[PDB]
Amino acid sequence: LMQFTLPVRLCKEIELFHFDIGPFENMWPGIFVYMVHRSCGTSCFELEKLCRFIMSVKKNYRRVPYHNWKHAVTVAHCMYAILQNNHTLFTDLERKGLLIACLCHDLDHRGFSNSYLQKFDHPLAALYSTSTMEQHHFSQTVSILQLEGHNIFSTLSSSEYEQVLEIIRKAIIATDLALYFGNRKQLEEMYQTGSLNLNNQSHRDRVIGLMMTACDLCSVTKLWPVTKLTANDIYAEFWAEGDEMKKLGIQPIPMMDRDKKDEVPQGQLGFYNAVAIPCYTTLTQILPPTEPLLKACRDNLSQWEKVIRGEE
Ligand SMILES: Cc1c(Cl)cc(Cl)c2nc(CCc3nc4cc(Cl)ccc4s3)nn12
Ligand SMILES: [Mg+2]
Ligand SMILES: [Zn+2]
């Protein structure tokens, strides 16, 4: 009967979409367990195995500016908020699988894109020809699930276990933004022609893929100071990749070229209009209680519009 509790401010604000998990690394495991316990149940996982899993997941994130352990927990918290706001829509295995998938979705990221691994000719690019880093993240997740004392799913049947690992695999693969565009277009058509059916497994898969994009991008749904300071970590990676491209004798795209900092504000506008706003719009159409994500995203677009107008 060992409940996790949070100080009052965190207990109230963790329920909101725009919650920031804060700078105290040591509180992030407890924040995650708190979320598993309320979204899934105190009965979902054996506490000792869950803690051991969380700490090995953490040890397998690297000290990179953006694709780090803080990002993992942040993406899990956005999934927690979606799940808590859409209580009755998700199966017991989905609740179990999706927080784990979010915690694991960038395991062992090096701060480089799929594109950079292909141009560098990294061994992973020969092992996994598409969604290269995402196939790796899922491979690291199965490794950790198979360490002694780390099987958090040990009470599921063979077939339930296979179903949860299949939810996790698909959820992690869906965080490849290259796959997002086509997934969102199909969901838009299905919703607008009324063919969307949440009893159809291949439809559920698409909706979970869209949820994973929404959680992965959730920096654009925070309070503006969080959004703006997170953008600094995102560019610190992209600019390092740009430098590594210049070392291979390749002009990087402007997004990755630190010499073109001036173009960031306009680049953020394209990103909100082409990626983020379409993401949270379709999500809000399918799952109305996720509207606060769309509202926060549009508020951050206006802040980037002010940066261009020289008002910030
Ligand atoms: C906020 C955010 C999240 Cl949450 C996730 C991802 Cl993947 C992401 N990518 C970007 C970069 C968007 C872009 N910047 C630039 C900069 C220039 Cl000079 C030229 C073109 C572009 S296009 N922002 N971003
Ligand atoms: Mg990723
Ligand atoms: Zn991510």
Return the CATH number at 153: 1.10.1300.10
Q: Is 203 in the pocket of ligand 1 (CB under 6 A)?
A: no
- The finding on whether 260 has its CB within 6 A of some atom of ligand 1 is yes
- Residue 67 annotated in ligand binding: yes
Ligand closest to CA 271: 1
Identify whether 8 is part of a domain.
no
The continuous run of DSSP H or E covering 100 comes out as helix 92-104
CA nearest neighbour of 105 among 211, 202, 16, 181: 211
Show which residues are catalytic: 67
Ligand 1 atom at shortest distance from the alpha carbon of 227: 1
Are residues 93 and 163 in contact, defined by beta-carbon separation less than 8 angstroms?
Answer: yes
Helix (H, G, I), strand (E, B) or coil at 86: coil
* Pocket flag, ligand 1, residue 31 (CB < 6 Å): no
Spacing, Cα 268 to ligand 1 middle (Å): 6
d(CA 171, CA 206): 9
Q: How many domains does the chain have?
A: 1
Ligand 1 probe mutation, 20, 268, 277, most atoms within 8 A of CB: 268
Kindly write down the DSSP assignment for every residue of 177-234, as one continuous string: HHHHHHHHHHHHHHHHTT---TTSHHHHHHHHHHHHHHHHTGGGGS-HHHHHHHHHHH
The verdict on whether residue 71 carries a ligand-binding annotation is: yes
DSSP 94: H
Q: Which two tokens stand for residue 119?
A: 């141009």
Q: Is the CB of 270 under 6 A from ligand 1?
A: yes
110/211 Cα distance (integer angstroms):
24
Does 289 fall in a domain?
A: yes
Calpha distance 8→233 (Å, rounded): 29
Which ligand ends up closest to the CA of 135?
A: 2
Task: Confirm whether 244 is domain-assigned.
Answer: yes
Q: Is 267 near ligand 1, meaning CB less than 6 Å away? A: yes
The answer to whether position 20 is within a domain reads no
Running DSSP on this structure, what letter comes out for residue 164?
H
Asked if residue 136 belongs to a domain, the reply is yes
Say if ligand 1 is within 6 A of residue 271 CB.
yes
Neighbours of ion ligand 3 (CB under 5 A): 106, 216
Distance 309 CA to ligand 3 centre (A): 30
194: alpha, beta or left? (left if phi > 0; alpha if psi -120 to 50): left
* 77 is known to lie in a ligand binding site: no
SS3 110: coil
Q: What angle do CA 60, 118, 275 make, to 5 degrees?
A: 75
Say if 19 falls within a structural domain: no
Is residue 107 domain-resident?
yes
Asked if residue 99 lies in contact with residue 132, where contact means CB atoms within 8 angstroms, the answer is no
230 within domain boundaries: yes
Q: CB of 238 within 8 A of CB of 253?
A: no
Question: Going by C-beta distance under 8 Å and a sequence separation of 6 or more, which residues neighbour residue 266?
Answer: 308
Q: Which residues contact 78 (CB under 8 A, 6 or more apart)?
A: 17, 102, 214, 215, 218, 221, 293
State the residue range of the domain holding 100: 27-309
Tokens of 284: 């809000």
Q: In which residue are the tokens 């394209």 written?
A: 270
What method was applied to determine this entry? X-ray
Ligand-binding annotation for 150, yes or no, is no
